[PDB]
Write a structure and sequence with these properties.
Elements: H1 4-16, H2 22-25, H3 34-37, H4 42-45, H5 52-60, H6 67-84, H7 90-106
The chain binds ligand UL5.
The ligand CNC(=O)c1cc(C(=O)N[C@H]2C[C@@H]2C)cc(Cc2ccccc2)n1 binds near residues 81 and 84.
């Protein structure tokens, strides 16, 4: 965590990693293993990979200085999914659902 707004961000992160959302969050838990998934163009198309384990390490290391920096990494993770995948792939449906969880709770940021 860190500041009051970063504690709200840390709360969101814990929720995104929780059993509550595991049915659609699991593709975002760890970095995409492009080689393992046969996605040999992944790193040509996605210049800045991002995933929830990386967000968690950056939060634990007090890398994020504000909520905006945290949100930019979470949205980068979703954007990468929308950029690489055809819009009818199950992983895109899962990204949309997890981003809905993220955006509605991020909007409840304490001022
Ligand atoms: C963040 N993960 C991913 O982007 C990803 C991508 C692909 C994948 O194969 N993409 C291909 C279709 C483009 C060309 C597969 C998975 C794993 C997965 C499988 C089934 C259901 C949810 C996830 N994750």
């Amino acid at each position: 965590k860190l500041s009051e707004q970063l504690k709200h961000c840390n709360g969101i992160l814990k929720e995104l990693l929780s059993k509550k959302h595991a049915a659609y969050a699991w593709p975002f838990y760890k970095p995409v293993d492009a080689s393992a998934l046969g996605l040999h163009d992944y790193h040509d198309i996605i210049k800045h990979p991002m995933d929830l384990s990386t967000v968690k390490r950056k939060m634990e290391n007090r890398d994020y200085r504000d909520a905006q920096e945290f949100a930019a990494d979470v949205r980068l993770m979703f954007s990468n999914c929308y950029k690489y995948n055809p819009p009818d792939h199950d992983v895109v449906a899962m990204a949309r659902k997890l981003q809905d969880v993220f955006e509605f709770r991020y909007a409840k940021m304490p001022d």
